[PDB]
């Protein structure tokens, strides 16, 4: 499991309408660029169709791993996990390990921390999706785990 | 008054070029009478490939996407398992489709699988119909689709 | 299975705000009053909480059978079936028989016909819920089936 | 393409499993299906999830490709047949709808209570088809019409 | 800044009067420091009874409802099976609760079940927390509830 | 309240079921649990849904109250253990979380791949507890610590 291609999607109404700069997307790009090859980045509103268009473009572009940031919370606009999780053929224990680490950093606020990861399979092909919260700091923490484990996950995901 | 639409035909052989797609063109022909054609692609019987196409169509503007093939009970058949989980509302299309077929093929409809549903964004709606591969099965679906598509779109958008 | 108590709930934003008269609710009351005892009627907006408050009040009031009318369609406001169906411990084939009959009356429009029925169980107690579409005519058709079958359903539902 | 299949029958009945009501439905199924495949398994079990599952997998271990359960499909607290089996299916069939359509002719609106299902359980290569029918002899005969008509179509598409 | 809240304690014995409810009062006491108390009832370990109470509380105005009891693995225990299906968003409360318990009881947390979620209407939100019956288990839940309730309400209402 | 229980062990391994890798994990489970309950069943089965299910219900028919599977819990296409069993549980336990918490000390972030589960299958009166563990000997020892600590608590609440 020597290298991989990866895409990045940031989900926010404000980011999408250019009213906030996205720092989370670029942090994932920079951090994963040490381990593999960036091939896709897009910002999309908090919208199930736009999120899924972006997930499948990233996959079309070759991404073996895709990380989304944003839309994981409990508001009415938040649809990231509801849109993506039903496509999984295997679900990983990411959210759980993400929460144990984030406890150190936010304690009982992890009750509101939502984050997941899964494998979408084709006949041969495998994609790992990680969905992180929108904050820069949430993402920074997520990345430590992704960097550490992404190779291990790919090796096993590929039979 | 109109909609834009896309068509995906799912089959391994079809995609390897080693069989002709009669079913797709038939859908394209028929629905062009009722609305505008904006996408077509043939994909293997593969989840990632099916979804890439589905969302390409939707990105091209399709309000309605019809897929054909991959709805069976063989290990390869992944079309419905792949798309159903995305529905925010599911229509009773498969049931109606099966009643209409039970008049051509009877008890074989035990094996007939079809479905339709709505995928929603903040405002936008998309109706997806997934039909079997046979030209006959598609013919039956088209009658139902062309009869009800505008109705579905009306109620979905409200 | 000699008699039963029954409640009726009508789900519509307009009905709730007094901008349309409800004729469906009263038609269920009149028609089921030939077979059992009316004990609850309320009109509620197309709102998951208000619908569920009304379902459980009707059940508190003694209803063994409750029929709702409205909110079964495919619009963004329509939440009746999504709110109620997850509570079922047994699901009946009502929607299917409802659709076969409604074919005669609307043909291929039954693709948009949605209607269900189920049993909510307590330790001993049993409630049958029927959820019909909002139109008077849809309901009129539903009632033929409910009148015909409600006793049969109760007899079996009660072990 | 399949030449002939093996089958199992399981009647699920508290009264039957005890010795109190005579099982008329299992034997009918065995008679009818014995005309088409080799009967390899029969058992009367109480309306009990673990017993029903123990039976299903014994039928399967004995080489059954098709298994038909009768009983335990209704709406009482007793009835666990569909709830026990259905979550094992890798593919579900439209058997109940077809069953209900034929049945409607002989019982009309009573079909609102009719429950019956069929689906495929798969191994890495192996396939098993399970039909679950109601308990009455009449319900069983209508189901048998359908199985007799489609068992080979089903097995053939099920194995690819 | 505040919310209204309700408390339901689920137990057969509790409801038959033949055991005292220590856990409920404890919840009422604690949450009265943070917000207004509008409902309390003791119900048997019965789906219909639990839901009647839940929606009575909500009808009384509760923005937050805490239930205690019925979350176990016995045949009677129906509290979570009864309420979870109503959630439009589920919180990671049970997980956090279990980490905090794994420090008192260790490996016994294999048996600990708790949950929380949001039920939404057109505009209105309601947060429901479902905790075990033991006074100890409730104590642990209260620490988490009182620490995060306002946060949850903030994000839920947005 | 339960005095002692019966148990079964199922190791799921394509290589093992063939005769190619020696099964070190099943025997460990049998040794450890034999200190607490009566061993009534053991079988090595391929990573195959139908074989795994046939085994589970044979363990159960032999009177097992507790059954522990090792293997087939990962993220390859091969791995079907959790997918085959979990949908049968009437009540699911928080065993995976606890498993993952203990495991985190010896493998940290690798626990993102750790999958393990436990739940209860019920009959009308009877209860069966199923634990599904990963295949490695180390993963199995961490699971055994937990089962040894809780098997009786679990059985006791499971039967009421």
Residue numbers in the entry:
A (entry chain A), C (entry chain A): 11 to 169
B (entry chain B), E (entry chain B): 12 to 169
D (entry chain C), F (entry chain C): 10 to 169
What is written in the article reporting this PDB entry?
Within their active site, molybdenum or tungsten are chelated by a metal-binding pterin (MPT, also known as molybdopterin) forming the so-called molybdenum (Moco) or tungsten cofactors (Wco), respectively.
We determined the crystal structure of PfuMoaB at 2.5 Å resolution and engineered a hexamerization-deficient variant of PfuMoaB using structure-guided mutagenesis. PfuMoaB was crystallized in the space group P3121 with three molecules (chains A, B and C) in the asymmetric unit. Each PfuMoaB subunit consists of a slightly bent central β-sheet, surrounded by six α-helices and two 310 helices. In the crystal structure a hexamer can be generated by rotation of the asymmetric unit by 180° around the two-fold crystallographic symmetry axis. In the crystal structure of PfuMoaB residual electron density was observed in close proximity to the Gly-Gly-Thr-Gly motif. Therefore, only a sulfate molecule was manually positioned into the respective electron density patch leading to an improved overall model quality. Thus, hydrophobic residues of α3-helix were identified as key residues for the association of two trimers within the hexamer.
